[PDB]
Subunit: 219 residues, 6 copies
Amino acid sequence: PIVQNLQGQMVHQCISPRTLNAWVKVVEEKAFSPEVIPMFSALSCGATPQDLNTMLNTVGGHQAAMQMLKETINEEAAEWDRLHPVHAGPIAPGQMREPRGSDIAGTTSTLQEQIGWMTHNPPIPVGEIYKRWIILGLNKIVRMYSPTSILDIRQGPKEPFRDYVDRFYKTLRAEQASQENAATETLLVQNANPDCKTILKALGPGATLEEMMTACQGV
Amino acid sequence: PIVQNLQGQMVHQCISPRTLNAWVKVVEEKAFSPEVIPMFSALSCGATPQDLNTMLNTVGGHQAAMQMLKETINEEAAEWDRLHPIAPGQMREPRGSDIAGTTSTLQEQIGWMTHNPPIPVGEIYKRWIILGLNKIVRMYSPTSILDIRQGPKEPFRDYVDRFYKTLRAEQANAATETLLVQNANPDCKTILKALGPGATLEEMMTACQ
Amino acid sequence: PIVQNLQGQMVHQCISPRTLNAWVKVVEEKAFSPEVIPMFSALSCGATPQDLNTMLNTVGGHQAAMQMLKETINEEAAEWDRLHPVHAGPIAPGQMREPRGSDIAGTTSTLQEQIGWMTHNPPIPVGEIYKRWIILGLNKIVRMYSPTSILDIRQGPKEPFRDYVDRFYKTLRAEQASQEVKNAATETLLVQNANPDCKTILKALGPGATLEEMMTACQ
Amino acid sequence: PIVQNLQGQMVHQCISPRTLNAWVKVVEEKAFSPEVIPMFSALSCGATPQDLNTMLNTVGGHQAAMQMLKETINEEAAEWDRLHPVHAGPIAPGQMREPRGSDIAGTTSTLQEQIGWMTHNPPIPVGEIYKRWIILGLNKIVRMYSPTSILDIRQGPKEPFRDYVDRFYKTLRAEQASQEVKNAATETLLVQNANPDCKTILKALGPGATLEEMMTACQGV
Amino acid sequence: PIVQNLQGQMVHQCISPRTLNAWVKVVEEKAFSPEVIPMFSALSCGATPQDLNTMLNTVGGHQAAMQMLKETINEEAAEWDRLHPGQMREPRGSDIAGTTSTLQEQIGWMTHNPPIPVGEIYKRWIILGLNKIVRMYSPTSILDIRQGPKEPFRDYVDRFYKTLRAEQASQENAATETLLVQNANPDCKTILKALGPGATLEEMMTACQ
Amino acid sequence: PIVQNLQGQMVHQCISPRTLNAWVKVVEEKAFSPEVIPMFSALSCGATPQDLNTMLNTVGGHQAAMQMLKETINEEAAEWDRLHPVMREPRGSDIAGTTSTLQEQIGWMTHNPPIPVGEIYKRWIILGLNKIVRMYSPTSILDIRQGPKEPFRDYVDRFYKTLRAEQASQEVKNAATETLLVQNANPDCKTILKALGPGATLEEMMTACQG
Ligand SMILES: O=P(O)(O)O[C@H]1[C@H](OP(=O)(O)O)[C@@H](OP(=O)(O)O)[C@H](OP(=O)(O)O)[C@@H](OP(=O)(O)O)[C@H]1OP(=O)(O)O
Ligand SMILES: O=P(O)(O)O[C@H]1[C@H](OP(=O)(O)O)[C@@H](OP(=O)(O)O)[C@H](OP(=O)(O)O)[C@@H](OP(=O)(O)O)[C@H]1OP(=O)(O)O
């Protein structure tokens, strides 16, 4: 990554073995659960395109997801090339060549060029752009790899309400690739067992989740 | 987080993998026991709203508690917007979603936190998060304090352990402790009542040994 | 904690996750064995009252011991307030206010104030004072939670002398006897409670035998 | 490795035990799967030829692959010597002798000479050149140790399409030591080797479908 | 410990949790095998008497050995007081052992010009006591190490020099070579005597391969 | 070890617990396999004689090998004293850290020009470890024969692993090793290898015998 030292310099630093092993183990253990996407975004803090490619390429399995991710990266790179055409001619002294789509993705750019863009005045954050594309692709992968539909989450006859809500919002987070309505509240209240459904319907509209789980604690 | 370097400057630093793994494992292993809230407050030392959202979002399970936490954060953000509705260099004040890192960038968060005077959006957001976590800890407590009664052959030390564990869970005030003397078995209750008021817990546990 | 940087300044540093995990695991694994108190004193090196409260509050179990520790801390704070009365007289124009009992315990003081007292010239080491109180309370807890009395430590018929002396001095360390009481109780109880073989051998060594000679003769 | 410190100096640093153990365990657990090569490239960040030789020599097994790697390194060194004949003359003042093939491989060069080449202005990245050669040899080893041909990857009757594509691009990555492998023949072989149901759906999607659309259309079949 | 930072200054540093855990686990796993003494000497690099007392006091078991070590430290302190009955004050025996000296005084002696290494002296005493403990905790006598009928010579020499290192509290003579050749099984004994006197261990183990 | 700080100075640094534990675990797990010697050379990077003695003395087992190593170190020190008759000049035992202090070792290693007592001692230690590795080698290269159904890759693995063990080195390939390699292969792979002809690289040999 590119981090700031003690002398106030933006310098390049080798990616640590702890970060590599952490990302590899996160992918091995959690597959493409939603919480993988924050973790990735946290483990690639200040990363260069080379570091991002390193994190993605060290994954051994999930090659379908990785190939999808390459297709998404190519789409976003083509859009970047359409919106930011690199002008021909020679580069002025003291200036950097403008990055193509593959330059942001670390395919046709060197590490020295990536450091140059990221530490230039004004900076071109190629690492953050590439990370944005990668996070788009990973959102697609998370939505695709979601196992269960939200319509199939129904509270058991003797299942506690807390576990039912856990499965509900876990499934919803998996299918939306996001933790961010009225249809969700109605689907939530509708799929409860008769007791909790009667209590929740008795609570009236406009109720919060804390009140809902408090009213069904032990029912 | 935003930390002070060995040269005296307040700079931004990437959140360490050990802190992330430590928080994730704390949530996975301890669920929402009370001691999770201090640990969190220690692992988010000097954290920005982005770092707080990172710590909360890396949690895989307990999505009911996390959604409750989002509701609490939205409530506190709406309250902030209600309590905080032109100079040349008048810096913009943070909205509710700006403190929560929803509508603010890392550059803006560092801007508020390092301004003169500073607006510690990280500490405010951490205050809201700790409120929500207090609610979650209070709800996830298994037993009520009124249901903590000393067994016929239960040692007094274990009974006090369960008593103050449950009490700590439900109080995420001082008159509740009176229940400790009331819910003891007849022997220990008679001895403790004989000790009178002003008796410390050490004397109580010694008298019932 | 408060540590020294490169330019010789005493600055505040966030408590590391390794120290937190080390303290939590020490409490979980060793309960309130005596060696926990030195370990604590080592893990809280240079700690502020906030850091000490963090270390105490991260303990999940032993809430009876933690409440006892809170009572002891309140006692020592009240004694501090008794020994340092707030004087009603002429204060110097640059006279900094002295910390109260609750200020040293981190209850009514902020982190900036704690750093202020600890880094002042001359310093008021509120962290070391609070750590002294906490170590007093932990001493009480260790003394109370000691399972066996020293009078009940008797060498087994086939128990090796090394294991018997190990249990003897472990129990003695747990009960915390003064050097005179530990020397008398050690001289009479140690030799007296040995099995007939080791007792005969030890008696054959003559008076004034050191523990090394006693354990060598019974090997 | 040669890294930059807090004061912006390029200094030599002893290779860390964590990097050594990480590389050794990666070789022990993953053998010569493709993902080993990126990992290597990450663990040898800023490495000198001496550090590269250290990482390669700490490998205990796979001595056939290691000896092959020595042959590849010697070939690339001979090619370097063919492309850069050092002039039989005296070294200019304030300069360094140009590195031969064995100098880049750390065989006939000292650590101080490697630091000299790597920290000179302009630098001669002997570590990056040697790493390029090593990555060539490791690419050969990965392609050779690939167990299955891409032609033998056929979707099972009840195998999910996601697992079939996983095995497909995993095998293809192993056989090419690369992930930029998706062309026309791979897309047609991919659609062709699917089970009748998924093959009918994929052909019904039409030409030019993305992999996301292909796996979405065959989800739950 | 007192270590040198990146700016060439000798400063005091808090003992790291990794060193504490390393020492505690070394004592728990290896007990008082000889190799514990070098490890200790490595983990107490640059340590003050306070740090040494910290390392010794964190040991939970082996309280007999710890009391022995305390007695040995008191003996060496009494000997130091016997040898030492703008002039800086000299440290007494209890000052070197960290009993009657503060951390400020220890740093004062250790960082003076010329330095008075109270930490290295205390470490010398502690290593003496630990040598005593290692010699006592040795399980087997060297005279009882005899090569088995089908035991390889390499394993026999391993046990031989492990036991010898345990009873010497050091691995650094001729009676050991004669006892070694004497304690071999008949085959290896005939081969070793056929090698002749003055044979090195490499030749002895090579001849029995 | 002696490492470089921010002011460009060579200063002494306490040996880390992770390096000690790494070396101890390497000895416990790998015994005296050849790859231990590079690992050692990497874990003692910039080490002082005191640090080298620390790494060697923390080994709990293999006391026969450690005593052999002590004998080799004493031989190399006596030879150093014979070749260099007498800051004070270092003796053989001074380089081995026996009769020298840490301050003296730092003095020699940080002098201009430096006297690398750590690198000399490390050379001696690596000599002794080479002896130990060659002795602890289990099998002779002449006993490595390809099984009837053993893949050629595994046979070459055992071949060059055994050869590396018997020479304490990887630079071992020559004409005798190539002819012994082709000779000890099973009839099928031997026929294919003979069909390749001379000058065939190991890559071509392993490709021709695949499957
Ligand atoms: O006190 P800590 O926060 O736990 O700092 C440690 C310490 O780093 P510094 O002393 O440089 O701050 C370790 O250094 P050692 O002395 O053990 O070598 C280092 O380990 P490395 O040697 O592997 O650099 C480790 O870093 P890592 O996280 O990469 O394990 C890092 O811990 P933090 O990174 O968590 O601060
Ligand atoms: O001495 P230990 O308490 O057993 O500490 C180890 C050690 O961690 P540290 O050296 O950072 O304290 C391992 O680190 P390695 O050098 O083996 O890498 C680490 O393993 P990881 O590398 O996987 O982090 C492991 O952690 P884990 O529990 O996740 O296996 C952790 O053990 P504890 O966590 O029990 O302290």
